[PDB]
Amino acid sequence: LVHVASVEKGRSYEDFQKVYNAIALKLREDDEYDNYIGYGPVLVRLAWHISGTWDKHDNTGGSYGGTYRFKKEFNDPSNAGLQNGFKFLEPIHKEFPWISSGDLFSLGGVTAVQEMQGPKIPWRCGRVDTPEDTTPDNGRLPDADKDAGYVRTFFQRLNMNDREVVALMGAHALGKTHLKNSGYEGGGANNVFTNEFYLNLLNEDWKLEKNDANNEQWDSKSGYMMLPTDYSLIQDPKYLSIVKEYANDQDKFFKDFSKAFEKLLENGITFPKDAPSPFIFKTLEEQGL
Length: 289
Ligand code: HEM
Ligand SMILES: Cc1nc2ccc(F)cn2c1N
Description:
Blueprint: E1 3-4, H1 13-29, H2 33-36, H3 40-51, H4 71-74, H5 83-95, H6 101-115, H7 148-156, H8 162-169, H9 179-182, H10 196-203, E2 206-210, E3 216-220, E4 225-226, H11 228-235, H12 237-247, H13 250-266, E5 269-270, H14 284-287
Parallel strand pairs: 1-5
Antiparallel strand pairs: 2-3, 3-4
Helix pairs in contact: 1-6, 3-6, 3-13, 8-12, 8-13, 10-12, 11-12
The structure holds protoporphyrin IX containing FE and 6-fluoro-2-methylimidazo[1,2-a]pyridin-3-amine.
PDB class: oxidoreductase
Keywords: Cytochrome c Peroxidase, gist, desolvation
Assembly: monomeric
């Protein structure tokens, strides 16, 4: 099963920078969402969930087809809460209806990371909307109530190694859990991209507890929380070494996250030899906007 990237007809870097800017301007304008966290974190999560359905074995799922727009995927219990990100992107799509759905969802995540002061994430266009019967079944996204062995095995399906996994999980510094979405709650909240996930793992005093949804989670007396899968990154000795590396080197974390996140968003896509080079978008700040 081959998905060849096909550039939206007549579009170039400038066209996509305009879409980036519209997303970024709306992030600034709709600042009140989720108790003033804003839409940044949920857009990052949306980009990951549309990509994380991928299966390397048969090239099903992945970001290419934009299939989150169909009810089966939209209503995946694993995707509860992401409807907010979809609703955010709706007026963007109306302003730029030429962009494919997969390109819009993935660009939303890139824009959110960069506007939240994260690393630059190179991004490629050319995802093409595929029909409803290409939507992956529910159940391909990861469970949170598991251990390091589960995490490691799960991410092999996405062709991610230990370093890539630990780097990607640093996104859990962003946003927060919501009891009504996932059965996890707490840990305060944040909308600036940093390496604080790793610092909190290492520096906080953690205690395993059951929450009000009867689910296990690790809680600190500072009020932070870790999922069992988050905490597994310091229980496993191979993950722990990488956690320490990122806790002690902000730039290295940024660079490795950028590579892993681009890879995540591009898994399953075949790019022609003469496809455009990846785009690196300027932030609003860099443009004086
Ligand atoms: C073992 C892997 C993972 C598990 C089990 C997991 C699980 C979860 C859960 C349960 C939530 C709470 C959702 C809610 O209640 O609204 C969440 C939120 C979030 N996840 Fe993950 N996740 C994983 C990997 C990732 C990755 C790889 C990324 C991105 C690179 C990511 C980005 C996010 C973000 C940004 C949020 C905050 C969303 C918001 O504030 O609305 N996660 N995740
Ligand atoms: C601040 C914060 N953000 C997240 C995102 C996902 C997750 F599972 C936990 N998180 C915590 N504690």
